[PDB]
Ligand binder design. Sequence first.
Ligand SMILES: C[C@H](Oc1ccccc1F)C(=O)O
Ligand SMILES: [Zn+2]
Ligand SMILES: [Zn+2]
Ligand SMILES: [Zn+2]
Length: 458
Amino acid sequence: PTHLSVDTKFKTEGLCVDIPGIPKDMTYRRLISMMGFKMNYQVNGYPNMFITREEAIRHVRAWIGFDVEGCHGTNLPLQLGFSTGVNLVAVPTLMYKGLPWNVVRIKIVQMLSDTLKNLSDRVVFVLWAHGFELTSMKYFVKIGPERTCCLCDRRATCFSTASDTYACWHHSIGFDYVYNPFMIDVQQWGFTGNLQSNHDLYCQVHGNAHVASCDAIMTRCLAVHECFVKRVDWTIEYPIIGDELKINAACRKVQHMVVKAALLADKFPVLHDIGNPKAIKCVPQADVEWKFYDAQPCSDKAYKIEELFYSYHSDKFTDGVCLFWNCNVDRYPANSIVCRFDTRVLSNLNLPGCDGGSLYVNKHAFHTPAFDKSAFVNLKQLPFFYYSDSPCESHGIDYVPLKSATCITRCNLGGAVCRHHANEYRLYLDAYNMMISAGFSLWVYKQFDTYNLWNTFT
Ligand SMILES: C[C@H](Oc1ccccc1F)C(=O)O
Ligand SMILES: [Zn+2]
Ligand SMILES: [Zn+2]
Ligand SMILES: [Zn+2]
């Protein structure tokens, strides 16, 4: 029970308008053969072009929606649409004019390689299969045993007929065939009605401009909805592909800094920590009464503050301060410290999601509801600052004297930042900029003022 058996049944009703007469009784084995591919009884790491829903979820970074619409099918031009927004027109002889397959296949390899090189070791074509997309694969896809890249140790994803060589997404410049792609037909999952009617039940952000790329985007969106919005699996781990470790470490440093300074500046007697049920006190030495409230990361809509706080805990969330560290609510109370992931951010960790939301993949996959500026009406943006009450002592990298109004330390109060605090400030600032650029936004109660931290040095 690891791969999808080629002898598994494939429902063909969705294919019979493009392919009339198609047998009702059909396996993946017969479908792959009908698509013009020969598997040759091969136990060389590629047992099936099609994969299970579980294998698809583990490889969500590889997902590329793909749709083919007949422009006029042997004698007719085809419009090839991808979830990157690209539309290519292939003649048998972003909107691109009609061109023969030998040049279309070069564009396909370039587009996939540039989209996927920093995300995944493969491609998973996410389909809402009606026939033409499956019969078009023979024109740009080659299959065979699992291979390695000619220039590196990564698995091969592309083939070149010019050189008779194989390459990964990073080394495929000039390559013309997609090699050993994977695919999944969403229409096999058991749906009633067409793609648009199922997609529109959960999403208003993607429309139907009636082009192939619109269908491709909708197909991947419906797949993300089914796999990450309604169903949520936090047991699945994802490989490190970027700055995951530094971002996570930075997040822990900023949370401790900000919460510690808020408690020192306003002396709240109670902190209401709302969110992750596995949360730990981020400022363990603080005097404050720390109370926890369990809420898993919402993946569909942001929590209504009325449901989190009301229906009869100190009960009085108005006493002291509320900490919402990645706990996405519709409207934060005025007495809050907030970290909210901005879904609009462009990065290799943040994948496009459903209904304005995004799929943030860092160790685990978290579908996050659309960033909404109106959630922060009772608060303000948290300014950058660095605070430290530790002794001014170097212990144990070169130096240029630090001058900064935001280095809140005893040495800066005394008129000259020490070397230890300058090094810690620069480290903190790098961690802070890393967290911000990853897409996290920080918000605080309007009365927050770092001028109140200077008198903690007496
Ligand atoms: C990020 C990108 O966003 C849109 C794409 C098409 C239409 C509306 C969108 F918001 C996507 O979902 O692929
Ligand atoms: Zn390579
Ligand atoms: Zn959508
Ligand atoms: Zn110092």
